[PDB]
Amino acid sequence: PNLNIVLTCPECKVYPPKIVERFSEGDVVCALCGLVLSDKLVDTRSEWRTFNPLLDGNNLSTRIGKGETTDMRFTKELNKAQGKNVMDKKDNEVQAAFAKITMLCDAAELPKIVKDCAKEAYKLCHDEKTLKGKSMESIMA
């Protein structure tokens, strides 16, 4: 429902926003009357400094491993709990398939581009109806 902010100059109002963005001053200004359109400009490079949608999608997950000061009993109970919830999603085949495909590509000394193209192809096929089997070896080859 709308939610689209469009910057316009109320003094000029003669054309769609043909503006200039001053990053050093942190403003955006109309290149005609010289009137600023917005102050306090946000950055995208600065938030990126601390840090894959193409393959993993929007799914999120976090690992549980052992801690600095912890017991080995709690590490097993948390991993066994995830082992019971691993059936909630059918994405175990993508990680194992990409693992074995990773082993074969690393065994064939092929570049990473062919690895990403092959993983993308297997992601395009995945589990469709026209495949109807092939025992996971033929779709990988």
- Cα dihedral 122/124/130/136 (nearest 10): 10
Rounded Cα distance between 97 and 140, Å, is: 8
Nearer to Zn ion by Cβ, of 32 and 94: the residue is 32
Residue 105 is labelled as binding a ligand: no
User: Does 30 appear as a known binding residue?
Assistant: yes
Q: Which residue among 2, 3, 128, 130 contacts other proteins (CB under 8 A)?
A: 3
Encoding tokens for residue 125? 């096929």
Under 8 Å between Cβ of 120 and 55: yes
Specify the stretch interacting with other proteins by CB under 8 A; choose among 65-73, 93-101, 112-120, 133-141. 112-120
With helix as H, strand as E and coil as C, how does 82-129 read? Answer: HHHCHHHCCCHHHHHHHHHHHHHHHHHCCCHHHHHHHHHHHHHHCCCC
Among residues 10, 67, 73, 88, which is the contact residue for other proteins, using CB under 8 A? Answer: 88
Q: Is 39 in the site for other proteins (CB under 8 A)?
A: yes
Binding site per annotation, positions for Zn(2+): 9, 12, 30, 33
Residues at the interface with other proteins (CB under 8 A): 3, 6-7, 16-17, 20-24, 39-40, 44, 47-48, 50-55, 57-62, 84-85, 88, 111-113, 116-117, 120
